[model samples]
Target: VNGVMIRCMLNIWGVILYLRLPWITAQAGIVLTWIIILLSVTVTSITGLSISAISTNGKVKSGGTYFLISRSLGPELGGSIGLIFAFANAVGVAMHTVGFAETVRDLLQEYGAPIVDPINDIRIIGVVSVTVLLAISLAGMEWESKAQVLFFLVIMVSFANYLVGTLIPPSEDKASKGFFSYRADIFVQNLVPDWRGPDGTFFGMFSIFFPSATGILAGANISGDLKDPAIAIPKGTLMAIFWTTISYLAISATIGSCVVRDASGVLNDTVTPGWGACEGLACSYGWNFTECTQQHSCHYGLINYYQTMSMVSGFAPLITAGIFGATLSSALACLVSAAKVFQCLCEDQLYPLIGFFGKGYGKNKEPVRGYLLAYAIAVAFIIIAELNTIAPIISNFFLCSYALINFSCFHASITNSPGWRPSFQYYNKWAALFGAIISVVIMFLLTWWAALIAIGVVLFLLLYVIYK
Candidate 1:
C-alpha cells in the first residue's frame, strides 16, 4: 500500500500530463518521443531492481529511499544524500501542489466558475495542505493507509474511464489512420533522423531522458513501508514504470500518426500548456483542425484550455475528480517520507536542527520536530516560488540529487565492499563495475549543469562527514 501510494505521488500525474509527454513530442517528434519513454522505463527498472536487492537483506524502515541506501552503504553517505533528497522531495511536493492549484483554477475558468485567486495565494494553499497532511499522519499509519487507498481508487477509476473512451470509435473528424500507422517511421524519422538540431542526437536524446527517469525514482523512494521490500519494491517499481512507458508510447504513437504536421512543426508547435496532455492530437482539449497529411501549422494556433475527463467519457469526470484527490493524498505521503529522512538526520546529530517534535532519544523513533521542519521548509519554498519562476530551479535541484543517488549506487556497487554487499545480491561483483560505468555515462548525457551541482553537494557532504 505504501508502495502504491508512493507510486501515485511520484508519478505526478498532472505534471506528466502537462510536461513530459508533450515536451518530448514537441522536441523530438512522435517517433523520438517513444524512444525517450522506452529508455526512461529501462533505466529506472535497473535502478529499482538494485534498490530492491539491497532492501531484501535488511530491516525495512521509514526513511524509504534514504533508509534503503543508508543501510546498504554507510550512514555518512546516506545522511548526506538523504538530506539532499529531503530538500528535493519537499520542494517537489510544494511545486506539485502549486501545479494542482493552477489546474483547479484552469478548470474553474473553463467552466465559467469564479472563485478566489488560488494561484496568487499558493503559499497559503501550500501551508493549509501541508498542515492537513501532518494532522493526518499524526493520527497514525492506519489512517494514512485508508486515506491513500481511497485516493487510489479514484485515480484508477478515472484512468479506466479514459481507456474506455479512447476505445470508442471516433467521429469522422476524430478518426486516425489507426494505432499502428506510424509503426514503420516513428523511430527512424524522429530519433535517428538524417538531419537534426543542435541537441537532437543520441546524446541529446539521452540527456532529455533523465527528467523522465527521475520521475520514476519518486515511486521507488517508498520501499521501506512495503510489506515485502524485496519482492514488493521491485515489482511495484517496475510495474509502475512499465505501464507509464506503455502509456507514453501509446499516446505519442496515436498523436504522431493522427496529427497533421511536418517534422519540425511537430517538434515546435504541438506543445499545449499544462504539459502536453490537454491539447493536440486526440487531446482532452478538443481539436480545432482536421488531418495530419503534411507539415503545417495548426490554424487554431494555441491549444490552451482545461479539458475535463468528461470530454472523453461520461464517467470520466467523476474519475478525474478522484485522481485530483489521490494526487493530494500522494503529496502528503511524499511529504511525510521526506520529513522522516530529515528527522533521522537531525536525530543522528548529522544536521544542526532539532527533530520535528523535538529531540527524542530512541534508536529509531519518530522525530516530530523534523516533520514540522520539513513542512515549514516546504511552505517557505512555496512562498518564494510564488514570487518568481522558481519551478525550474526546484526541478533542476531535484534532478541533480537524483544523479547523485545513481552515482552513489554505482560507487557502492563497484567497491563490493562488505558494507554494500549482502548474502544475496542482484548483480555479480562485476555488476558494480558495470553499474558505476553506466552511472558515469548516463550522468555525462543527462545534465552537465546538474552534475556540477551534485559535485558541490558531494564535496560539502565529504567535508561535513569528516569533521562534524
Candidate 2:
C-alpha cells in the first residue's frame, strides 16, 4: 500500500503535474488535456482490473507481473513481455533520476544561482543522483521504504501548498484582463490532429503524459511483499488511480481556467506575474523572440504558478523539498521493481549464461545481481539523459506490457479456464479486451516508429525464446 501510494503520488501528482501539465496545456489546450488525462487514467485503471483478476486467482509470488502473465499465458510470451517490462523499469530509474536533476538545475537557475552551463550541470547531477539511489537500493528495501515515507510526506505538503495557492486568486495587478475567456478554437485544434509547435503532436504529448498513469502497477510489482495480494492489489491500485486522476483533473482545470496563453500558445508572462517579465530579460540577454517565446512557454503556467505560490505563500522551501523528494522516491521505487523483475528472469533461466542474477544476497533475499544490472543500465542512459528521447521509448514498452496484461485476462475469461476463477468480482472480458485494444491504438498514435520498434523487439524476443 505504501509503495503504491508513493509511486502513484510521484508519477501522477508529483513531477508530471508540477512540470509537464503546463507544457501539455500549452500544446493541447486545457479542455483537451483534461480529456487526455481522463482517457489515459480510465484505460490504465481498467487494465489494473485485469491485473487484479489474474493476481487474485492464486498465490502471487515474486516476479510480480512476469509471474502472473507467465503462469497464465506460458513462458514464451511471459519471457517476451518480462524482458521489455524489465527494460522499461531500468530506463524508468534513469528517467526519474534525470528528472530530479533537471528540477534541481531549474530551481538553482530560477534563484539566480550561477551554473557554468545548466544542461551539462544537469547531466552531472543526474549521474550523482543515480549513484546515490543505487547505494540506497543496495542498502535494502527497509531503507527504501522508510525513505519513501519521508518523501511522501514532503509531497503531500507541497500538494497542499499548491492547492491553497491555486485557489486564491492572482493579485489584481498581475491578473490577465480576460483570464476566464475560453478559446474554443484552440480547444478544437487540440481535439483534432495537429502539431502546433516544435514540441510535437497532441499524441506525442499524450505519450509523455500517459506514463504518469503507468505507476498503477508499482504495487503489483511488489506483490510478494503484500500480506493479501488478492485484496490489496484491487483496492489499493484502484484507489490510487482514481484519486490521482481526480487530482490531475482538478489541477489541470485550475491552471487552465486561471492562466491565459498568447497568440503563439505560450503562457502570457505579462499577466502571470510570477516569473518576472520575459521582455526585459530577452532584451538584456539579446535573445530572439522565438527563443524568448520557447522559454516563456516552458517556464510559465503550472511551473510559474507553483513558484508564484511559494513566493506569495512563503512555502518555497517546502515545494522545493517536495519536488526533490517525489523525483528521488520515484527513482528508488523503479530501481526496486526493476531489480525484482531481473531476478525473476534469471531464476526462470530465460536467458543464457546470466543465471547469476537469480541468486539473492543476505537475510531479506535482496536481488543484488539484478540491482547491479539495473544500475549499469541506468548509468548508460543517464549519460545521455534527455527526457524527451527517453520518455517515448519507456511509454511504448509500458503500453506493450499493459496491453499484454489485459490480453492475458481476456484470454483467460474467454476460454473459461477451469482454474482461472478470481475473487475480484468487477471484472469483465469486454473491459479487458477494450483495455488491450486502446493500449495498442494509443501506441501507434503516439509515435508510429517507436511503437513499431517496441513491437519488433518483443517479437524478436518471443522468437528467441521459441528457438532456444
Candidate 3:
C-alpha cells in the first residue's frame, strides 16, 4: 500500500515528461494534445479496470504480469507474451538510459564540453549508464522489486521546482526563445498543430506519448514484491493511473500554455553533439539559437529542442537532475523487472530451448543470468542511442502486452469459471474487451510493420510453446 502508487508515478514521469512533452504539446497543439491524452488514458484506464478484477480474483505470484496472464490465459499465450515482454522490458531499460544520455549530452554541450560525435557520445553515456545501473542492481543480495520503494518525494520536489521556474519571470534570453510568457495569447499560438517531421504527425505524437500512459502492468510488474498483491495492486495501480494521468494533463497543459509550438532564436532543438551552424557560418558547441537567425530555417523550437525545460527553469540543475534522477530510477526498475520476467519465462519451460536463462543465484533464486542477458540486450539498444528512433517500438510492444492483458481479464470474466470472480468487482467484461481491441488498433495505427513484427513474434512464441 505504501509504495504501490509510486512505482507507477516514478516510472511514469520519465523521458517524455521531462524532455518531449513540450515537443508533443507543440506538434499536436493544446486541443489535439489533450485528445491524445484522453485516448491514451482511456485504454490504460480500461486495462486498469481489467487488472483490478484479474489481480484480485486470484492469488498472484512472482512472475508479475506473466504470472497474472499465464494463470488466466494459459502458458501458450502467456509465455509467448512473456518472452516478447522480456525484450520489451530490456528495451525499456535501454530506452530510459538513452533518455539519460540525452540529458548528459545536453549538459556537456551547454558547458562547451565536446564529446565525440553525437550518436557516439550517446553510446558512450549509455554504455556507462547501463553498466553502472546493472552494478547497482547486482549489488543487491536478492531481487527486491517492491512497487512502493522509491525516492520519489525528492523526484516530486524537483517537479514542483520546475513549475516554479516556469512561473517566475522568464529571463530575457528565455523569453526570446519563447520559454515563458504564460498568457492567453501564448496558448493561441500553440493551440493548433505545427508538424515537425513524419514522426511528429498527430498519430506519431500519439504513438510517442502513449507509452507513458500504459500502466495496466506497472504495479503488476512488481507482483513479486508486494505483501498483499491482490489487494495492493488494484488500489495502488488504478489510483496511480488516475493520479499519473492527471499529472500528465496538468504538465502538458502547463507546458502548452507557457511555451509556443515553435519559436525562433534562443532555441536549442538539435541534440547532435558538436552540431552547430548559424546563418551558414561554422558554429561550434555551446552556441545559442541567437547566433543563427530564424530566416535560415533553424532547428531551434519547442518541437525541436529537448532542453527547453531546463532553459525555462529558475534553478536549471534541479530540473536537469530531475531528468537523470527520474530516468535512472526508471531504467533500474525496468532492468530488474526484465530479468525477473525472463527468469520466470525460462522456468516455465513453455517455449523452446531458452530454459537455461532460468538459471539463478542466491537462495531466493535471483535471476542473475536473466540480468546478464538483459544487460547485453540493453547494450545493443544503447548502441542505436536515439530516443525518437526507439520510442515507437517501445510503444508497440507495450500496446501488445496491454492488449493481451486486457483480453486475459475479459476471458476470465466471461467464462464464469469458479476462478473468474475478482474481489475488485468494479470491472466490466465489455470494457476489458474494448481496451484490448483499442490497444491492438493503436499499435497498428502507429506502425503496421512494427505491429506485424510484434504479432509475428508473439505468434511464433505461442506456436513454439504449443508444440513444446
Candidate 4:
C-alpha cells in the first residue's frame, strides 16, 4: 500500500492486462485460463518467496539477486546472466513498444484518422513511441511517482466503465461482436478451451500470459529506498501479487461472461438463438445462443478484435484513454528501466563489457550509451508488430532469470552457506529448488529449441568470460 507497491502493481498490469485476457480466455476458456493463471503466478510466487528469503538472510542490493549469484557462481557466469538479463530488459522495452503501437493505432482507427495500411501504421507509431521514450530517457528527467499516479487513475476510471457497462443490455453490434449479456449461460459457453492456430497448445497460450505476473522486478527494484528493506520487501511483494491474482480472476470471469469467445456466422445471417423471440441480430432463448462455434471472421470478437474492451465499456473513448495511458506509462517505465539495467551491468564490469557504457555523463549519471543500445534493440523488436509473437520469447527470457534466481537460493540453503535463513520455515531449500525446477521445465515447455538457444547463448558467453 506504500509507494513501492504501487509501482510493482502498475508494471505487472502492463500490456496484456489491457490487451489479451479476453482472447486468452477465448482460447483457453474460463477453466483452463484459470489454471494458466495459477502456473504463471506459481512461478513468480515461488520466486518472490525466494527473494524474501535471500534479502533477509545476508548482503543484498536493489540488484540483490544479481549480487547473490555473482558471489556464488563467480563473476564470469554472473555477467553471463547479467548480459542475457540486459537483453531480457531490452525485450521489456520491445514488448511495451509493440503493445503500445498496436493498441494506440487501434485507438486511431476507431477515432477516424487512420493510415494507408494498418501494418505500416503499427511500425511507424511503434518507432515514434520508442523515439519520444528515447527522448525522455536521454534527458533523464524524474517525475515518475506522480506520473504513475495518472497511470493508476486512468486505468481505474476505465475499469469502472468496463465493469458497469456489462450491466447494461446487449445490442445488435454488441451481440454480434461479443454478447454483453452478463448472463450465466454466456459464461458457461466460454468455459472450455478452443486453441487452434500455429503452436495452438496449452503452453503456447501459457507463454502469452506469462509476463502478466512478472512485475516482481519492480518490487525488487525498491530495496535502495525503503526503511527495513529486507523485512518490507517480502511482505509487500506477496501482498501485491495476491491482489494481482484476484484482478485477473475477476477480469477473466467478466470478459468470458460478457464477451463470447468468437462470434460466429452473423455475416451470413446464420445466428440461431431459439426463444421464438427475435432480437436485433439473433434470437436469444433465455440466456443461451445456438451455433456458438460457428466461424465467421466478419464477426468482431476478441480473436480478430483487440479493442472490444473499448466497446463493452461505459464511454467507448474512455477505454481508448485507458489503452493510451496504460501503454505510454508502461512504455516509458520500461524505457527508463531498460537503460538502468544496462548501465548497471556495464559498471559492475564483471563482464568488463567495458567502461564507455559505464562512462555515463550528467548529474544523475544517465547512461546515453546504454539508452542508445536499448533503443536499437527496442527498434528492431517493435518492428515486428505482432504482440503474440513477441510475447512467448519474453516468457522464455524471464523464465531463465527465474531459474537462476531460484537456484541461487537453493544452492545457498542446501549447502548451509552462511546466506541461508533457517528460522524462516515457510521458505526453504525445497521451495527454492521447486521454483528452479518449474522455471527450467517451463522454458522447455513453452518452446524447446528456443530454450536450448537461450541456454546456448548463456553457455557460450559464460565460456568467453572463463577463457578470457
Candidate 5:
C-alpha cells in the first residue's frame, strides 16, 4: 500500500506541475488546457482500467507491466513493447535530473547568484544529482521509499503555498505593472481556433501536457512488491489519476484567472530589463516578443518560470525545496522502474546480448548493471539534450506502451477467451478499444514524424524477435 501510494504521488505530481503549468496556461489558455488535461487523463484512466482487468485474471509476479503484457499478448509483441518501455524509463531518469539541475541554476540566478558559466554549472549540478540518486537506488528500495516520504511532504507544502498565493490577488503595485493582473480580453481571445500560430499550438501543447498523465503506471511498475496486484493496481492508479486531473484543472483555471499576458502572449517585463524592455531597442533587434521574454529572462524562461511564481507567492525557499524534492523523487522512481524492467528483459532472455543486463548484484537482487547503464545515458542527455527535444520522444514511447496495454485487454475481451475471466468488474471491451485507438491517434497528432519513428522502432524489434 505504501509503495502504491508513493508511486502515484511521485509520478502524478512532480516538477512539471511547477515548471510547465504557468507556461501552458499562457500559451493555450484555460479552456484549451483543461481540454488537454481531461482528454489525456481519460485515455490513461481507460488504460488503467484495462490493466486492472488483466491483472485480476491470474497471479501477477515480478515483471509488473512487462509480465502482464507478455502473458496477455505473447512474447513477440511483449518483447517489443518491453524493450521500448525500458529505454524510455532509463532516459526519463535523466530528464528529471536535468530538470532538477535547471531549477537550481535558475533559482541561483534569480537570487542574484549567477554562475560564472551557466551551462557548465547546470551540467555539474545535474551530474551530482544523478550520482546521489544512483547511490540511494543502489542502497535498496526500503531506503528509497523512506526518502520519498520526506520528499512528498515537501511537495505538499509547496502545493499549499502555491494554491494560497495564486488564489489571493497580487499586491496593487505588482498587479498594476506586470504579469500579475487578470486579463479577461486576452483570455477570451485565446478561446478561438489558432492551431498553427507561432505561440505553441494545440497539438504541441498536448504533447507537453500529456506526460503529466503518464505517471499512472508508476505503481503498476512495482507489482513485484505488491501484496495484492489486482486490487492495489486498480484502486491506487485510478485514484491518483482522478486526483491529479482535479488538481491540474484547478491550477490551470487559477493561473488563467490570475496571471495577465501581453498582446503577443508574454508575461510583460518578466525578463531582464534590457532584454524584456518593450522599447524600440528590443524590437529593433528583430526578436519576437515571446522569444525575447522566454530566451533571455531570469524569471520567464522555461528554466526560470517557477522562480517567477516563487517571487509572486513569497515562497521562494519552499518552492525551491519542492522542485528539488519533486524532481529527485521522480528521478529515484524512474531509476527503480528502469532497473526492474531491464532485469525482466534479461531474465526473459529476449535477446542473446541480454546476459549482462539480467545479472543482479547485491543481496536484494539489485539491477546494478542497469543502474550504471541508465546513469551513462542520463549523463549523455544532460550534456546535449534540451527539455523540449527530450519531452516528446519520452512521451511517445510511453504512449505506445499504454496503447499496447489497452490493446492487450481489448483483444482478450473481444475474443471471449475462456481464460479471460477477471475479478475487476468496472471495465468493458469498448473502453479498452477506445483507449487503444485514442492513444495511437494522439501520438500522431503530437508529432507525426516522431510517432512514425516510434512505430518503426517497435516494428523493427518485433520483426527481429520473430526472425531471430
Candidate 6:
C-alpha cells in the first residue's frame, strides 16, 4: 500500500540479529539447529500460505495479526487474541530495542570512547531512537519510504560483505555441505542434545522459534493495507520466510565454522580461537559466552557476536550505532500495527477504555489519536522492560502469541465456512494440519513455562467473552 507500511514490514527482519538463534542452536548442538530450521520453515510456510488464502477472500484491513483471525472467527475471539498479540509484540520490540542500544553503547566503550551505563543507559538510546523514528513517520510517508531504502542499503552492504568474506571459501574444503543433512545423529544431536541452561529441551527448540514466527507475521498483519491482498500479501509473506530462513542458515553456518581469536580468553582452556575473533568493543562486564553459558544465559552470547562483528569488521561505533536504527525501525513498525488494532477494537467497542482515544472521520479513515495512544503504551512497555520486570517474560510471551496466531489460522483454514474463498489452495489440507501440529507441539515443548503465560492471557480473554 504505502511506503510506511512497506518499511514497517521490512524492519521486522532486524529481529534476526538479536533473537539468539545461534546460541540456542549451539546448546542443542548442530543437528537440532537443522531440525528446528527445517521445522520452522515448514511451519512458517504453511502459516503464510494459510494467511494469504484467507486474506485473499476477505476484505483486507489492518488491525495487526489478530484482525484476520477476528474476521474469520468472530470479533470477540479476534479482539482477545489481538490484545495479547499487541502487548507481546510491544514488549518484544522494547527488549529488542534495548538490545540494539546496548550493542551501540558497548561498541563505543570498546574503542575507548565514552559511554553511559552500558546496560541501563542503552534503554535511553532505545527511547530516543523510537522518538526520532516516530518524528520521521509523522513527517510523511515519502520520507519513511526513503529512510527504509537507505537503511536497507546499509544492512545489505554489511550483510553482503560479511557473507562474502565468511561464506565464500578460501578453498573448496570450505564449501557448503549438509544442505539437506538432517538425517545424521549429529544433526539430531544439534536439535536438543544438551542442557547448557535450565530451559534446554525439545520444547526449548520450539520456544526459540518464537522470533521466527514474529517476523513471518509482519506481512500478515499488514494485509489490510495491501493493494492486492490475495496476491501481494501472500507473496510478501512467503518472501519474508524464504529470506529469513536463508539468512538464518547462512549466518549460523558461517559463524559456526569460522575461526576467530578470543583475545580476552587466554585464561580459559576451553575457549576456542573462533570464539572471540569477530568485531566490537570488549564486553565491560567481563561477561563472555564462557561465563554466560556457565550462568545459563545464552542470550548474552548472541549479543556478544554482534559486538564481535563490529570489532572484526572494524566499523567501531558506526556498526553499533546502526543497531539503534534497526531497533527503531522494528519498534516503529510494531507500534503502527498496534495502533491500527486499537482503532479496530474501538470501533467494535471491545475495549471501552480506548474509546476516548479513537479518531478519524468515517469507517475506514485513519485513527487521529491512534499513533499517540500507541506511543504512550509503547513507552510504558519500554519502561517495564528497562526495569527488567517485563523483559524476561517477553521471549516466552512472543512465542506463545505466535502459536496462537498459528492456531487461529489453523482453525480458520479447516472450518467449512460458507463465505470462505480459497486462493492458492493446497491440494491437501493435511499439510497445514501437520504443520499446525508440529508448530503447536514444538511450541509446547520449547515454551512450556511460557505456555503458562499464554494460558493466562487466553483465560482472561475467555472471561471477558463470558462476562461481557
TM-scores, all models, native as reference:
0.72, 0.83, 0.89, 0.90, 0.86, 0.74
Q: Score each candidate by Cα lDDT.
A: 0.54, 0.70, 0.75, 0.74, 0.72, 0.55
* lDDT score of residue 393 within candidate 1: 44
Which ten residues in a row are the worst by lDDT in model 3? Answer: 279-288
Per-residue lDDT of candidate 5, residues 1-468 (tens digit): 576756786777766677777677777767888888889888888987887776677778776777876776678878877788878877777778878888888867868987676778788888998898888767656876577778878888887887776666666434422334344653564443333234378877787767677767677777767777778888877777788888888877766665444313243424453554453122322323454344544334212244445655546588888888878877777777777777777888888888867788788777788778878888887885356556777788889988877886788777876765777889898988888899999899887997898889877888897887
Clashing pairs in 2: none
CA shift at 31, candidate 3, in angstroms?
0.7
lDDT of 1 by residue, 31-105 (tens): 556666665555555555555566665666766666667777777777777777778667766765665555555
lDDT of 4 by residue, 310-346 (tens): 7787688777677777767666766666677677778
Candidate achieving higher TM-score, 1 or 3: 3
Off by over 4 Å in 4: 59-77, 264-282, 285-295, 419-425, 466-468
Model 1 worst lDDT run, 10 consecutive residues:
299-308
Candidate 2 residue-wise lDDT, 128-225, digit = tens = 88888777667656776567668778888887886665555544333322122234442343343323556557677888887677766676676777
TM-score of 2: 0.83
Say which candidate scores most in lDDT.
Answer: 3
Please list the Cα RMSD from the true structure of every candidate, rounded to 1 decimal place.
Answer: 7.6, 5.8, 5.8, 3.4, 5.3, 7.6
Give the Cα error of residue 239 in candidate 3, in Å: 1.4
After TM-score superposition, the amount by which residue 51's alpha carbon in candidate 3 deviates from its true location, in angstroms, is 1.2
Better of 1 and 5 by TM-score: 5
Superposition error at 224 for model 6 (Å): 4.5
Residue-by-residue lDDT tens digits, candidate 3, 357-392: 677987877778899999999999888888888888
Q: For model 3, state the Cα shift of residue 285 in Å.
A: 29
